[PDB]
Enzyme design. Structure first.
Site, PDB file in Angstrom:
ATOM      1  N   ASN A   1       6.415  21.048  35.985  1.00  0.00           N
ATOM      2  CA  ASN A   1       7.967  21.142  35.400  1.00  0.00           C
ATOM      3  C   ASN A   1       8.852  21.947  36.539  1.00  0.00           C
ATOM      4  O   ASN A   1       9.737  22.276  36.065  1.00  0.00           O
ATOM      5  CB  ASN A   1       8.243  21.088  33.535  1.00  0.00           C
ATOM      6  CG  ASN A   1       7.939  22.631  33.631  1.00  0.00           C
ATOM      7  OD1 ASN A   1       7.781  23.380  34.153  1.00  0.00           O
ATOM      8  ND2 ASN A   1       8.320  22.537  32.400  1.00  0.00           N
ATOM      9  N   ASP A   2       8.075  22.613  37.428  1.00  0.00           N
ATOM     10  CA  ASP A   2       9.063  23.071  38.601  1.00  0.00           C
ATOM     11  C   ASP A   2       9.462  22.497  39.684  1.00  0.00           C
ATOM     12  O   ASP A   2       9.726  22.332  40.826  1.00  0.00           O
ATOM     13  CB  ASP A   2       8.119  24.168  38.915  1.00  0.00           C
ATOM     14  CG  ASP A   2       7.572  25.405  37.902  1.00  0.00           C
ATOM     15  OD1 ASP A   2       8.383  25.523  37.486  1.00  0.00           O
ATOM     16  OD2 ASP A   2       6.485  25.908  38.091  1.00  0.00           O
ATOM     17  N   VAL A   3       9.576  20.881  39.152  1.00  0.00           N
ATOM     18  CA  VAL A   3      10.539  19.821  40.102  1.00  0.00           C
ATOM     19  C   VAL A   3      11.080  19.535  39.795  1.00  0.00           C
ATOM     20  O   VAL A   3      10.974  19.393  38.436  1.00  0.00           O
ATOM     21  CB  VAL A   3       8.705  18.745  40.842  1.00  0.00           C
ATOM     22  CG1 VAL A   3       7.988  20.010  42.013  1.00  0.00           C
ATOM     23  CG2 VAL A   3       8.312  18.221  40.010  1.00  0.00           C
TER      24      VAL A   3
ATOM     25  N   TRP B   1       8.614  14.263  33.334  1.00  0.00           N
ATOM     26  CA  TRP B   1       7.245  14.759  33.854  1.00  0.00           C
ATOM     27  C   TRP B   1       6.643  14.967  32.201  1.00  0.00           C
ATOM     28  O   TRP B   1       7.310  14.684  31.783  1.00  0.00           O
ATOM     29  CB  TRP B   1       7.740  16.865  34.668  1.00  0.00           C
ATOM     30  CG  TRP B   1       7.865  17.203  33.406  1.00  0.00           C
ATOM     31  CD1 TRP B   1       7.795  18.031  32.136  1.00  0.00           C
ATOM     32  CD2 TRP B   1       9.293  17.817  34.242  1.00  0.00           C
ATOM     33  NE1 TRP B   1       8.902  18.578  32.164  1.00  0.00           N
ATOM     34  CE2 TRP B   1      10.160  18.185  33.182  1.00  0.00           C
ATOM     35  CE3 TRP B   1      10.462  17.273  35.343  1.00  0.00           C
ATOM     36  CZ2 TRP B   1      11.668  18.632  33.006  1.00  0.00           C
ATOM     37  CZ3 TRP B   1      11.827  17.562  35.470  1.00  0.00           C
ATOM     38  CH2 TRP B   1      11.905  18.519  34.071  1.00  0.00           C
TER      39      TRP B   1
ATOM     40  N   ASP C   1      14.862  13.256  33.637  1.00  0.00           N
ATOM     41  CA  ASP C   1      16.197  14.360  33.614  1.00  0.00           C
ATOM     42  C   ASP C   1      17.610  13.012  33.487  1.00  0.00           C
ATOM     43  O   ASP C   1      16.631  12.202  33.319  1.00  0.00           O
ATOM     44  CB  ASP C   1      15.936  14.239  34.748  1.00  0.00           C
ATOM     45  CG  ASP C   1      14.870  15.662  35.319  1.00  0.00           C
ATOM     46  OD1 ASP C   1      14.727  16.353  34.413  1.00  0.00           O
ATOM     47  OD2 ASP C   1      14.447  16.240  35.807  1.00  0.00           O
TER      48      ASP C   1
ATOM     49  N   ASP D   1      12.073  22.309  31.502  1.00  0.00           N
ATOM     50  CA  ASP D   1      12.537  23.173  32.361  1.00  0.00           C
ATOM     51  C   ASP D   1      13.923  22.312  32.535  1.00  0.00           C
ATOM     52  O   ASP D   1      14.121  21.979  34.104  1.00  0.00           O
ATOM     53  CB  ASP D   1      11.391  23.471  32.778  1.00  0.00           C
ATOM     54  CG  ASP D   1      12.107  24.530  34.809  1.00  0.00           C
ATOM     55  OD1 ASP D   1      12.892  25.436  34.084  1.00  0.00           O
ATOM     56  OD2 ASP D   1      11.626  23.966  35.166  1.00  0.00           O
TER      57      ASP D   1
END
Ligand SMILES: [Cu+2]
Lengths: 128, 359, 113
Positions: free
Chosen positions: C88-90, C41, C60, C16
């Site tokens: 993966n929304d963070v 993640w 990242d 993401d």
């Protein structure tokens, strides 16, 4: 002899995936070293020994136990031994008698720090 | 010169006509902002800059706009400053900055990451360092007064509409943790529910279909769970399926972000659904919107989803807003079958959250 | 090689963000001037070529604004925040010296088990 130093970093990793204890050892000692620099409140590590099957259950109750209990349910009978939660740059130690290894069953060491048992888990065994 | 440019003006439309679209502007996340629109005609009313990955909510009394964001002295380098900002709702002007420890959640705009207690006295937000905890901000004192570290291992905030300063959070054990705050914002007491769902076998979306004294949740596989907090302890139950055998044969499952909603007056629950579901499709745009009767546990309607991902409900006006990331759809839900009223195009470039101004 | 620069590339099953491989880096190296995140993640991706499942770590690269190239949003085995390291929304740059998100890498850890 009967000593083992394990490490944990800021990447949620142990430097060992399996620990072996010598039968000759009456009492084993494990040493944990946090090689990262993140505070225990953010990225703490610890080591909890328990029967392979009890791992998840122990980790769950340990999560409810909180940090003040080193993320391990107090008086938990499923835990053979466990260290205190240490932060980056810190280290801990634990010594337990090896005269309690369920013959035929597997044991595993992991970190009960919330969400860490995912990767930070290994196989501790007796003999060779 | 007769004409003279002036500032200090208030939003041109009444509060009851306003909605807030949180534009993350993911492509240029350091310039996220809130766009204010008039849902009755689709007119752009103004905006509030929210720097890097901002989050937003409107105060219960509807007088202020609360934002949460992160700054750095030099954006990509320099000291970090996590804050909550208070803005005047009518003038859309900055009024106050509240310091937060450098760990406020940086992530997509799910409702449960930035909320407030029912009595509006406290702002309740999610922290991640990555270790999780909940932060409490005293509105009146404009100060961060509590760090609920007992919420470690849990995620998101669900305010209990039937209590002044209590909220719940979903935890890694598949249960719910309830937090009761004192008049000062610090934790007064807490309780843990029994396991509601299997984390491994039937994970639920965190977005609740919230009623006055109970909350419903949908799972990756189309099941519905419940948490009743009308009493002292939270009673959990479920699951029951949203799907019949025909739906299952076609692999229909839920999908989206703020994907569910509850029309309290009727008990109708709205959910975004898509066919051909499988591992990895839990965030797929809606092929349809299904309307469920939580009482009879039957589906009462299904309509085109318009590729929606998030929604929000206005209880009084019986309205539902859906958002596909850039466009906002307005629906009249006074009857079982939703009725499309209008679509506001280009409301944002990348939004997963829209909210009504409280009325 | 531009196979890795596709959101469909098997190792990116839980990405993401933006593929660092299209941002001046590779699946295992951060573009010049961006800083690797120590945390991430994790995802379990199926390699269709050999039919096996592997564990991928999504670190990242931080300290620089959005790369904007090869944006992907795949969710295989991704789970909500209550299973945080599978979420993966963070922003997995959240604990870096500078949390500005630049791009996402896809580090192969080993066979899933
Ligand atoms: Cu750990």
């Amino acid at each position: 002899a009967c000593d083992v130093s394990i490490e944990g970093n800021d990447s949620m990793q142990f430097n060992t995936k399996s620990i072996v204890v010598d039968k000759t050892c009456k009492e084993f000692t494990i040493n944990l070293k946090h090689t990262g620099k993140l505070p225990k409140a953010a990225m703490g590590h610890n080591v909890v020994v328990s029967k392979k099957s009890d791992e998840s259950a122990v980790a769950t109750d340990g999560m409810k136990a909180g940090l003040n209990n080193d993320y391990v349910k107090a008086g938990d009978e499923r835990v053979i031994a466990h260290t205190s939660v240490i932060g980056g740059g810190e280290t801990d130690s634990v010594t337990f008698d090896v005269s309690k290894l369920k013959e035929g069953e597997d044991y595993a060491f992991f970190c009960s720090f919330p969400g860490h048992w995912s990767i930070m888990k290994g196989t501790i065994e007796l003999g060779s | 010169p007769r004409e003279v440019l002036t500032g200090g003006h208030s939003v041109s439309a009444p509060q009851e006509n306003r909605i807030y679209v949180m534009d993350s502007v993911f492509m240029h996340l350091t310039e996220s902002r809130v766009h204010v629109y008039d849902y009755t005609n689709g007119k752009f009313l103004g905006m509030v800059p929210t720097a890097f990955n901002g989050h937003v909510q409107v105060s219960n009394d509807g007088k202020k706009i609360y934002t949460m964001t992160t700054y750095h002295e030099r954006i990509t380098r320099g000291k970090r400053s996590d804050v909550v900002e208070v803005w005047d709702a009518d003038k859309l002007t900055f009024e106050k900055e509240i310091s937060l420890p450098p760990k406020r959640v940086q992530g997509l705009n799910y409702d449960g990451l930035f909320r407030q207690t029912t009595d509006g006295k406290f702002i309740v937000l999610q922290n991640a360092s990555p270790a999780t905890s909940i932060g409490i901000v005293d509105v009146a004192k404009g100060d961060y007064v509590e760090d609920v570290t007992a919420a470690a291992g849990c995620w998101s905030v669900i305010p209990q509409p039937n209590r002044p300063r209590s909220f719940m959070t979903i935890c890694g054990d598949g249960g719910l943790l309830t937090i009761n705050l004192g008049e000062d914002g610090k934790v007064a007491s807490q309780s843990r529910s029994k396991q509601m769902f299997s984390v491994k076998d039937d994970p639920i979306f965190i977005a609740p279909a919230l009623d006055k004294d109970k909350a419903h949740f949908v799972s990756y596989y189309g099941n519905v769970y419940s948490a009743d907090f009308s009493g002292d302890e939270v009673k959990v139950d479920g699951p029951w399926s949203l799907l019949n055998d025909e739906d299952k044969a076609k692999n229909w499952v839920p999908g989206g972000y703020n994907l569910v909603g509850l029309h309290r007056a009727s008990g109708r629950m709205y959910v975004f659904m898509h066919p051909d579901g499988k591992e990895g499709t839990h965030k797929f745009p809606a092929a349809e919107i299904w309307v469920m009767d939580t009482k009879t546990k039957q589906r009462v309607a299904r309509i085109p989803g318009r590729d929606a991902l998030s929604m929000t409900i206005d209880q009084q006006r019986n309205l539902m807003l859906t958002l596909d990331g850039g466009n906002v759809n307005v629906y009249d839900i006074s009857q079982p079958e939703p009725k499309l009223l209008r679509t506001i195009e280009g409301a944002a470039e990348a939004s997963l959250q829209v909210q009504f101004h409280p009325v | 090689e531009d196979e890795v620069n596709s959101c469909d590339y098997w190792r990116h099953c839980a990405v993401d963000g933006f593929l660092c491989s299209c941002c001046g880096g590779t699946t295992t190296t951060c573009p010049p001037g961006s800083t690797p995140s120590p945390i991430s993640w994790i995802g379990t991706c199926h390699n269709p070529h050999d039919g096996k499942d592997y564990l991928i770590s999504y670190h990242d690269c931080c300290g620089k604004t959005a790369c904007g190239r090869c944006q992907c949003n795949t969710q295989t085995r991704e789970r909500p925040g209550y299973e945080f390291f599978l979420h993966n929304d963070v922003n997995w740059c959240m604990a870096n010296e500078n949390s500005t998100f630049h791009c996402t890498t896809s580090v192969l850890v080993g066979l899933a088990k």
